[PDB]
Amino acid sequence: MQDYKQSLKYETFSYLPPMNAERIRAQIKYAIAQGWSPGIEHVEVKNSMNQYWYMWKLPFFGEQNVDNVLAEIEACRSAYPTHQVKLVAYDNYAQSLGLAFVVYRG
Amino acid sequence: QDYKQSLKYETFSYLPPMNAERIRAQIKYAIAQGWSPGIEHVEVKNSMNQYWYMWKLPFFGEQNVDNVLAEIEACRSAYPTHQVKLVAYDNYAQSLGLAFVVYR
Amino acid sequence: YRQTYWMPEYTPLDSDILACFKITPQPGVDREEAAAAVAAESSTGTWTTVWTDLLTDMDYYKGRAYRIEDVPGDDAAFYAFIAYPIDLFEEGSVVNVFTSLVGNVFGFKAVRGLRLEDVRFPLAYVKTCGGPPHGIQVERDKMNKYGRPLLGCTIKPKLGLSAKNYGRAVYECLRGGLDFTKDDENINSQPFMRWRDRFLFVQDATETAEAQTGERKGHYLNVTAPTPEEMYKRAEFAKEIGAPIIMHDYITGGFTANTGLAKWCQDNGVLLHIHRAMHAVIDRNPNHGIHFRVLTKILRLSGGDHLHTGRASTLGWIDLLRESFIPEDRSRGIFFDQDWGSMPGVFAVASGGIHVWHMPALVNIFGDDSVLQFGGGTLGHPWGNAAGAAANRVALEACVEARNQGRDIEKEGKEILTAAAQHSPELKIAMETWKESGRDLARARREALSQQGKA
Amino acid sequence: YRQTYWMPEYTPLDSDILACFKITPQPGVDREEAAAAVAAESSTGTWTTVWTDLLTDMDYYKGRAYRIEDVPGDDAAFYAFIAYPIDLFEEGSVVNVFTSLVGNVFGFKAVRGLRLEDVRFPLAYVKTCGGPPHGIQVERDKMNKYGRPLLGCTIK
Amino acid sequence: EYRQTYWMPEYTPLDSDILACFKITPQPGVDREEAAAAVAAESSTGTWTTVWTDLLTDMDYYKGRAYRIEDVPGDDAAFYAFIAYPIDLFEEGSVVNVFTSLVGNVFGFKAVRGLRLEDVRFPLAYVKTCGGPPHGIQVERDKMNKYGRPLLGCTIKPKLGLSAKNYGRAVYECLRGGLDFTKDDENINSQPFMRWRDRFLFVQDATETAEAQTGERKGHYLNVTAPTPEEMYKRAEFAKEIGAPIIMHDYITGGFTANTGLAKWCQDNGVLLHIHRAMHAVIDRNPNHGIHFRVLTKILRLSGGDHLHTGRASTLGWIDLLRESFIPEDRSRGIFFDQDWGSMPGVFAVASGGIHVWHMPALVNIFGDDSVLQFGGGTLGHPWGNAAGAAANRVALEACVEARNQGRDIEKEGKEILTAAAQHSPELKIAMETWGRDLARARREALSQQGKA
Amino acid sequence: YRQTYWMPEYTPLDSDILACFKITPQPGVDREEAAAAVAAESSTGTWTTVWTDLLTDMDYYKGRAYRIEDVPGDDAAFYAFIAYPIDLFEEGSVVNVFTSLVGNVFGFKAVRGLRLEDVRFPLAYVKTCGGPPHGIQVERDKMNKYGRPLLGCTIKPKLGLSAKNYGRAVYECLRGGLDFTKDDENINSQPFMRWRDRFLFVQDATETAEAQTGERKGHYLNVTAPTPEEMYKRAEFAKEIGAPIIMHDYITGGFTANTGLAKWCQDNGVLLHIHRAMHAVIDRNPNHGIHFRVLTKILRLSGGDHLHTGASTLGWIDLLRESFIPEDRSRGIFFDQDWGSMPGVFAVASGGIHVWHMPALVNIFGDDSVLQFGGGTLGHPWGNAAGAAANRVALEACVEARNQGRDIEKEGKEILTAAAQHSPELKIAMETWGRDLARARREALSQQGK
């Protein structure tokens, strides 16, 4: 037997290894391919269970270029290097997020 | 003589800490009653929690005292700052026949 | 029966409730007369026309058979389609609609078998019912959960466990990565585990695993009870203690109780998980009884936030459960257009003897807005409930990350799971343990009606 | 299913709830194993024995098939008689007894048909339920009606 | 005359019948069959007479009837009558009605010199109608987080004259010393010198302060015995309002109606219920006329409590009656019927009354783990304070339990064990200077495999 | 014990509770150590002294044995008189006074037997208790009944009767001339007769019989219950349906419950008949237990409008009924008992009495009593109504005789036979089978006080 080591988690994909630029890219084009609007959020670690994270700028409505989203992630992380950074994708049909995951765990 | 207050840990924590011979006896007594030994651990600030972390699973049908004592020391090594508790599950009563903190 | 209750030229009004009965008639009866009988027996049930009828408008206040079809691949049975004016029923009462449709006619001796296949609830009647207390999107927002199906465990053994030991299993599961644990449908308040003690220790477990994971946890506390007063007392205690979700057995507890409980859940912000116990008594026999898709619709109207959904028919009632509009589709047993409007949809719940090796086919059949409930597939892990939960949770995510990447996750199943175990020892050990458009149509039609209206 | 849930030597206790299921089994299953399955599916429903079971007294907390009979004039079906200890249920809850007996097992694929024929409610469980609010004799006294069946009309 | 209707030696009791055993000391002229029959009639259908209204009913069903007579070992003046009562004679879930019916008339019967109710057989079908303990042993242990040892309590003295805050100070000192519980005396209600609401605030304050300083759940049996049900419940609600885990009631002097109601309230509210048996010696001391305490024991379990004070042979008889799931007949211990409790939980046996460190080995050896050990002067009387006496007792209890678990004979080896522990404990060392379940588990296994057989 | 608790020079205060205990000690005990032990065991629980005692006024908070007397006879028993300051007890709580006196001392190993004979309730404590909900005089005004004992019939069999058959026996009795019928002690809510159905038909019986006699009618509907909530629910339903009187088993249902029922009865204008079920467990052994006169005072404080009272007998009847009862050792009354304005309680006679007992019962109990005929009513050969009339005729002729000056007990057979020449029901029935002291004290006190 092997003992289960316990640690904080951060919802979808957090039970998998952190994502390289390649894996992040594929999630973003998945969202764009779904018609969802990419969005970026950040918050202090201790506050990650908050319903309302700081919004980085505005959602990227009509955004087709993955790379522009990937750069805005970098810029958000560079502005707040101690914060967790989240990617979300808005689904205006369902008034929900199609997808959301923590890009950097801070 | 004035009384010196300190935090305590339920059954046996008013006695001197147990060496290996004494721990084994409690383990042997629990097996002799037909209870299932179990091992839990938790951060010290959290000792009053109802739910500690389970170390592995309870040791059902276990007759080897020395294997439960090993897993205690195994659990201590993995969590040197945690309190370690030995418990003994009584299936008939749906209770614990025994519970005490092995390492504080 | 025929001359008054067979109306082949009647076109259903949009306010009408429509039913589809599969009738297997006795050898010496014609299809016209049997349809008209089922319509009469499920609405006026008149065996002799008397003077009090002449005090009423008999042409309005009656069910009417208006179409008959063959059952493909069965010359002995036929489909009878029946319209009921919206005025025959009490508003906001699945109890009354149910009783009216199925309360009398299944004992009709002149038929060999009777099976209610589908019911068309018109929008104007949908608007009179409370619906899910929350629904998929509200719940996701309340629990702050997006982009993946949710994951649950059903605690076993159903019997014999003290309140505290039961909370221990719950704690080990939740802390390893499941969102939800679940009371069995039989778990109410038995001698070995009184409900008040169960609620206290489960909530303790829920809070401890939530603090240790940073993700919201829940456990469907079963409030199925002998009496409405006991049901509501149990629900109130779950709210009092902070519990986000409760459970009801809506068939066996019954629709009156379930409808009231869903009303109470919306008024109190408690999520409501619905178990379908007893359904196979009603819905397994393909010749006699009520099809599960009817029981699906009744539950959406009555109210629930999750519903256990357990091939083509299966995918059909999931749509009926989750989507805003579902077109007619005989290949998936959907006999009428069903419009739900703004009435929210319900999480579909998959349970029953599934483990990690089912995960690709489950993410692929059910999609995101579903709960994947592992009974023995979580507890049976040779390392405990936490490792079993983590394995299921890793397998779930890797299948979601594969699919978002475009991969054929069901075909490439054993490969996605194998690349995943290379980082989760817990998922690897579990793999040696066990062997081996509905949305888009609904959106396409809302946009169509948004620009053109009636077109 | 059979080795734990078929107990042909068990004699029902008077506190036990008893059920009689008419089982029509699928062609390739024996009657012993099908009775034991119906007992398991209507009480513990276990598909894999796990560690939490070992925290409980598994011999007590389970339904048990204890007798099988033929269905007179039907060689395809048989009667399975099952005992459930009174502790499996919430007192004074037909809801709980009903759900327990019939909430899971009628979907058992390994059977062609399942029919619950009779249920033995032991006195010690009858005493926990409220019963008729009045009953025949109280009602007759309240309505001052004796010596004849009562007569009613259903308005149409 | 009663004999013809009420003496039925051919009757074998139904399993649903309430059975009673009376020790009857008849007057010199009366023979045993007629005494047994009168007792049976005067405790069911209270007459020998046949009036016309009786013929309206089934006189044969609706009666108690005596069905067996026995000698009393070593007492020719007295004999046992065993009497059966159809379950239908009694209101369900009401020990008040079974009590009244059994003992509310017959004890004045002039044709008997002495009448003593020895035992009552409650059938499983009637037990399932009563609420029982609000929690019982195993549930209370879970809530409090205490396993593997008897629980430890102290009763605050003086019972009279202490203000609320002074009282809480003796409570605080005891609890912080290692005792699990403290206790209002039976007479502590709401007297002018310590009004009940003030006592509850300061006791709870002491309870929280000692729990903070020890890391072990603490409680204090707050007495809600009151002039009226309204006052009883108000006091109970306030103890819950402030967070007290355990309350207390004098079930005999407050009464069976109030106590059943209190137990119900407790189970509905998660508050443990410690039961005091005040007045019982008025009833159960005289071995020729009254009600034996073992009957009072069974009525409490059915009415509801989580603890009961239980005080050789009979004493551990009624302890088994109080805690175990099934108790077989045993006349060597005064148990005259098998008593089946089913799933109704057992109640802690509480030992109190003039006990100190030296009684610990015998107490652990006799009561076992599932007991509370209440120390009056044995904690207050320590010469370093309450905290040290509490600690002394706690150490001596734990040493006995570790010694017992290790295979020692704690009674035969009492002095050595306490001395060896005295070495690591100045409090215990100076304190030393100043002063059954197997059966129920076996029957459950056998009935699991064989059932009725 | 004797050092602290034997206080022979202590003269009790008018505000003290006093208890008189008949102690039967083991052979080698001095009477004063036993008396001091009983004072201590019924007040402080101990003889020792721990450090917490010194935080308190030990001189005030303790019971005092202040006198010891011989028992005429049992030279192995003595009376111990004990005083308790009013402050040891919660006000308005017979439960707390009772618990304090008898909750502990009766297990004392050092005596062979302990018997609580009497308790002096000071007027300052009486005034804190609710007392009878109505009492003798208010009840006579409510029922409009003066000049005679009231008549009652306990319905039998206690068992097996439907509500409606039960109501039948009630109706036939009440219409015959009895004032009251009575639920039995054991009648609560059994399967053969649920309480709600019984209450309805009894009340039907009561109104039918009242309208056919023009006399107010009652039936003691027994609300003794498993819980206070059920007790109160049953009492509320009797009020909702118009029933004028209910019943409670005050010892077996209990003092907390009964004190609460009494106060609800006064708040709601419902008369309250009290049954002393199980008193004999407690009060029959002359060497160990609590005498029924203690139980009688407990009930008047707690609250009752009737009470079953079976030399000693006429003592506790005075205690139950009069405003002041002077000490009278010849009646086992060991203390003056002052009740002040607290109303008195109807004395209830029952148990196997019939017409032949009537002259004596009117003679012994007087007018302010209820005389309850079980089989004496139902057992009449011509049915319940005829036997009620027989009992009512006998009672009324015994009362007319007494008023006329005759010795009713000696001229008994003559009084009865003469009135049976006007009543067939009576004649066939024969063939089949304190105040002046209390008022003298009030006048004396009104004139010169002390």
Side-chain angles (χ1 to χ4, degrees), chain F residues 314-315 318-319 321-328 330-331 333 336-338 434-445:
Chain F
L314 308 97
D318 283 344
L319 294 172
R321 299 201 295 192
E322 316 297 344
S323 310
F324 179 85
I325 302 94
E327 170 181 15
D328 184 349
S330 85
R331 300 182 152 191
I333 300 175
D336 293 4
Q337 185 60 58
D338 189 15
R435 174 201 170 80
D436 281 327
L437 295 162
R439 160 185 227 172
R441 177 173 154 289
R442 197 211 259 171
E443 270 165 42
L445 262 57

Short mmCIF file of all heavy atoms in Angstrom, two decimals, chain F residues 314-315 318-319 321-328 330-331 333 336-338 434-445:
data_model
loop_
_atom_site.label_atom_id
_atom_site.label_comp_id
_atom_site.label_asym_id
_atom_site.label_seq_id
_atom_site.Cartn_x
_atom_site.Cartn_y
_atom_site.Cartn_z
N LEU F 314 -59.04 10.89 59.38
CA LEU F 314 -59.73 12.15 59.56
C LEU F 314 -58.78 13.30 59.82
O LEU F 314 -59.16 14.45 59.62
CB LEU F 314 -60.74 12.05 60.71
CG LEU F 314 -61.70 10.88 60.61
CD1 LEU F 314 -61.20 9.72 61.46
CD2 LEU F 314 -63.08 11.33 61.03
N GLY F 315 -57.56 13.00 60.26
CA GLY F 315 -56.51 13.99 60.27
C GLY F 315 -56.20 14.50 58.88
O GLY F 315 -56.34 15.70 58.62
N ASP F 318 -58.84 16.68 57.24
CA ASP F 318 -58.79 18.07 57.69
C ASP F 318 -57.68 18.83 56.97
O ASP F 318 -57.90 19.92 56.43
CB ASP F 318 -58.57 18.13 59.20
CG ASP F 318 -59.83 17.82 60.01
OD1 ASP F 318 -60.95 17.87 59.44
OD2 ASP F 318 -59.69 17.55 61.22
N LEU F 319 -56.47 18.26 56.98
CA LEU F 319 -55.34 18.85 56.27
C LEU F 319 -55.70 19.17 54.83
O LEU F 319 -55.31 20.22 54.30
CB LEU F 319 -54.15 17.88 56.31
CG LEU F 319 -53.53 17.60 57.67
CD1 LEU F 319 -52.51 16.48 57.55
CD2 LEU F 319 -52.86 18.86 58.22
N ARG F 321 -58.72 19.84 53.68
CA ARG F 321 -59.92 20.64 53.47
C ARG F 321 -59.98 21.96 54.22
O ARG F 321 -60.61 22.89 53.71
CB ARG F 321 -61.15 19.81 53.83
CG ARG F 321 -61.28 18.58 52.98
CD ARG F 321 -62.70 18.08 52.98
NE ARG F 321 -63.09 17.65 54.31
CZ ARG F 321 -64.20 16.95 54.58
NH1 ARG F 321 -65.03 16.61 53.60
NH2 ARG F 321 -64.49 16.60 55.82
N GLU F 322 -59.36 22.09 55.39
CA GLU F 322 -59.58 23.28 56.22
C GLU F 322 -58.45 24.30 56.10
O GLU F 322 -57.34 24.00 55.64
CB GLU F 322 -59.77 22.91 57.70
CG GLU F 322 -60.66 21.73 58.02
CD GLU F 322 -62.12 21.90 57.62
OE1 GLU F 322 -62.57 23.02 57.34
OE2 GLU F 322 -62.83 20.87 57.58
N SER F 323 -58.74 25.52 56.56
CA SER F 323 -57.80 26.63 56.48
C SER F 323 -56.70 26.53 57.53
O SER F 323 -55.59 27.03 57.30
CB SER F 323 -58.53 27.96 56.63
OG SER F 323 -59.65 28.05 55.77
N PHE F 324 -56.99 25.92 58.67
CA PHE F 324 -55.99 25.78 59.72
C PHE F 324 -56.22 24.46 60.42
O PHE F 324 -57.35 24.14 60.80
CB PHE F 324 -56.04 26.94 60.73
CG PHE F 324 -55.03 26.81 61.84
CD1 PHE F 324 -53.74 27.27 61.67
CD2 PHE F 324 -55.37 26.20 63.04
CE1 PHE F 324 -52.80 27.14 62.69
CE2 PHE F 324 -54.44 26.06 64.06
CZ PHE F 324 -53.16 26.53 63.88
N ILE F 325 -55.16 23.68 60.57
CA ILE F 325 -55.28 22.38 61.21
C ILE F 325 -54.32 22.35 62.39
O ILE F 325 -53.10 22.29 62.19
CB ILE F 325 -55.01 21.22 60.24
CG1 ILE F 325 -55.98 21.29 59.06
CG2 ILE F 325 -55.09 19.89 60.97
CD1 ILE F 325 -55.40 22.02 57.87
N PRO F 326 -54.82 22.37 63.62
CA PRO F 326 -53.94 22.37 64.78
C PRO F 326 -53.29 21.01 64.98
O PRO F 326 -53.83 19.97 64.58
CB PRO F 326 -54.88 22.72 65.94
CG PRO F 326 -56.21 22.26 65.48
CD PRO F 326 -56.25 22.31 63.99
N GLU F 327 -52.09 21.05 65.57
CA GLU F 327 -51.37 19.83 65.94
C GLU F 327 -52.27 18.91 66.76
O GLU F 327 -52.98 19.36 67.66
CB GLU F 327 -50.13 20.22 66.74
CG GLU F 327 -49.40 19.07 67.40
CD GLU F 327 -48.19 19.53 68.21
OE1 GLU F 327 -48.08 20.75 68.48
OE2 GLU F 327 -47.35 18.67 68.56
N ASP F 328 -52.24 17.61 66.43
CA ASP F 328 -53.08 16.65 67.15
C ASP F 328 -52.44 15.26 67.04
O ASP F 328 -52.81 14.47 66.17
CB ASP F 328 -54.51 16.63 66.62
CG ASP F 328 -55.43 15.72 67.41
OD1 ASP F 328 -54.94 14.92 68.25
OD2 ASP F 328 -56.66 15.79 67.19
N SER F 330 -52.96 12.62 68.51
CA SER F 330 -53.88 11.49 68.46
C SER F 330 -54.33 11.17 67.04
O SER F 330 -54.90 10.10 66.80
CB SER F 330 -55.08 11.73 69.37
OG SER F 330 -56.08 12.47 68.70
N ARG F 331 -54.08 12.08 66.09
CA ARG F 331 -54.39 11.87 64.69
C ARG F 331 -53.13 11.89 63.83
O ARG F 331 -53.21 12.10 62.62
CB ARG F 331 -55.40 12.91 64.21
CG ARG F 331 -56.71 12.86 65.00
CD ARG F 331 -57.70 13.88 64.48
NE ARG F 331 -59.08 13.45 64.72
CZ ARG F 331 -60.14 14.05 64.18
NH1 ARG F 331 -59.97 15.09 63.37
NH2 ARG F 331 -61.35 13.61 64.45
N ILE F 333 -51.01 14.14 63.55
CA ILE F 333 -50.72 15.48 63.06
C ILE F 333 -49.69 16.09 63.99
O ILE F 333 -50.00 16.44 65.14
CB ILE F 333 -51.98 16.34 62.97
CG1 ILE F 333 -52.98 15.68 62.02
CG2 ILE F 333 -51.61 17.77 62.54
CD1 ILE F 333 -54.29 16.39 61.96
N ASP F 336 -48.91 22.18 63.75
CA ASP F 336 -49.88 23.10 63.19
C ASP F 336 -49.58 23.27 61.71
O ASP F 336 -48.42 23.43 61.32
CB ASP F 336 -49.81 24.45 63.92
CG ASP F 336 -50.26 24.36 65.38
OD1 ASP F 336 -50.55 23.25 65.87
OD2 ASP F 336 -50.32 25.41 66.05
N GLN F 337 -50.62 23.17 60.88
CA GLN F 337 -50.50 23.49 59.46
C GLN F 337 -51.46 24.63 59.17
O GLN F 337 -52.68 24.46 59.29
CB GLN F 337 -50.78 22.28 58.55
CG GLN F 337 -50.56 22.54 57.04
CD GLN F 337 -49.12 22.95 56.68
OE1 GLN F 337 -48.16 22.22 56.97
NE2 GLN F 337 -48.96 24.11 56.07
N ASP F 338 -50.91 25.77 58.80
CA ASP F 338 -51.70 26.90 58.35
C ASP F 338 -51.66 26.92 56.82
O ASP F 338 -50.60 26.75 56.22
CB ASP F 338 -51.16 28.22 58.93
CG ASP F 338 -52.07 29.39 58.66
OD1 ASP F 338 -53.25 29.18 58.28
OD2 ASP F 338 -51.62 30.54 58.85
N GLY F 434 -63.10 19.70 62.65
CA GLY F 434 -62.01 20.30 61.90
C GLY F 434 -62.33 21.71 61.44
O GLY F 434 -61.52 22.64 61.60
N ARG F 435 -63.53 21.86 60.87
CA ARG F 435 -63.98 23.16 60.40
C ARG F 435 -64.14 24.14 61.56
O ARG F 435 -63.69 25.28 61.49
CB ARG F 435 -65.31 23.02 59.65
CG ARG F 435 -65.93 24.35 59.24
CD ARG F 435 -67.42 24.19 58.98
NE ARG F 435 -68.14 25.45 58.81
CZ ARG F 435 -68.16 26.16 57.67
NH1 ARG F 435 -67.47 25.74 56.61
NH2 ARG F 435 -68.86 27.28 57.61
N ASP F 436 -64.82 23.70 62.63
CA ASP F 436 -65.10 24.59 63.75
C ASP F 436 -63.81 25.05 64.43
O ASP F 436 -63.76 26.16 64.97
CB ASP F 436 -66.02 23.90 64.77
CG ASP F 436 -67.50 23.91 64.35
OD1 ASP F 436 -67.96 24.88 63.70
OD2 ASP F 436 -68.21 22.94 64.70
N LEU F 437 -62.76 24.21 64.42
CA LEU F 437 -61.47 24.64 64.96
C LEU F 437 -60.85 25.73 64.09
O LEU F 437 -60.38 26.76 64.60
CB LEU F 437 -60.52 23.45 65.09
CG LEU F 437 -60.87 22.33 66.07
CD1 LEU F 437 -60.08 21.05 65.77
CD2 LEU F 437 -60.66 22.78 67.53
N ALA F 438 -60.84 25.53 62.77
CA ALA F 438 -60.22 26.52 61.89
C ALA F 438 -60.92 27.88 61.98
O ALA F 438 -60.26 28.93 61.93
CB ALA F 438 -60.19 26.01 60.44
N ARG F 439 -62.25 27.87 62.12
CA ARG F 439 -62.97 29.14 62.16
C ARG F 439 -62.88 29.77 63.54
O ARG F 439 -62.85 31.01 63.66
CB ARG F 439 -64.43 28.98 61.75
CG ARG F 439 -65.29 30.15 62.24
CD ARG F 439 -66.77 29.98 61.97
NE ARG F 439 -67.35 31.20 61.40
CZ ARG F 439 -68.59 31.30 60.93
NH1 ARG F 439 -69.39 30.23 60.97
NH2 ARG F 439 -69.04 32.45 60.43
N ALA F 440 -62.85 28.95 64.59
CA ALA F 440 -62.59 29.50 65.91
C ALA F 440 -61.25 30.22 65.93
O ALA F 440 -61.11 31.28 66.55
CB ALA F 440 -62.66 28.39 66.96
N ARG F 441 -60.25 29.70 65.21
CA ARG F 441 -58.98 30.40 65.14
C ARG F 441 -59.07 31.69 64.33
O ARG F 441 -58.44 32.69 64.69
CB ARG F 441 -57.88 29.51 64.56
CG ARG F 441 -56.56 30.28 64.42
CD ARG F 441 -55.43 29.39 64.00
NE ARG F 441 -54.37 30.10 63.29
CZ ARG F 441 -54.48 30.59 62.06
NH1 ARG F 441 -55.62 30.48 61.38
NH2 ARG F 441 -53.45 31.22 61.50
N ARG F 442 -59.82 31.70 63.23
CA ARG F 442 -59.90 32.92 62.44
C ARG F 442 -60.57 34.06 63.21
O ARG F 442 -60.09 35.19 63.19
CB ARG F 442 -60.61 32.67 61.11
CG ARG F 442 -60.36 33.78 60.09
CD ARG F 442 -61.53 33.97 59.14
NE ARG F 442 -61.29 33.34 57.85
CZ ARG F 442 -62.21 33.19 56.89
NH1 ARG F 442 -63.46 33.65 57.08
NH2 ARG F 442 -61.88 32.59 55.75
N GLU F 443 -61.69 33.77 63.88
CA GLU F 443 -62.37 34.82 64.65
C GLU F 443 -61.45 35.37 65.75
O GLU F 443 -61.29 36.59 65.88
CB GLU F 443 -63.67 34.28 65.25
CG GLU F 443 -64.88 34.47 64.33
CD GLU F 443 -66.08 33.64 64.75
OE1 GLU F 443 -66.36 33.58 65.97
OE2 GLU F 443 -66.74 33.07 63.86
N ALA F 444 -60.82 34.48 66.52
CA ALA F 444 -59.89 34.90 67.56
C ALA F 444 -58.78 35.79 67.00
O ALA F 444 -58.44 36.82 67.60
CB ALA F 444 -59.28 33.67 68.24
N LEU F 445 -58.21 35.42 65.86
CA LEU F 445 -57.14 36.22 65.28
C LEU F 445 -57.67 37.54 64.73
O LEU F 445 -56.98 38.56 64.80
CB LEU F 445 -56.41 35.43 64.20
CG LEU F 445 -55.12 34.77 64.67
CD1 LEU F 445 -55.37 33.84 65.86
CD2 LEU F 445 -54.42 34.02 63.53
#
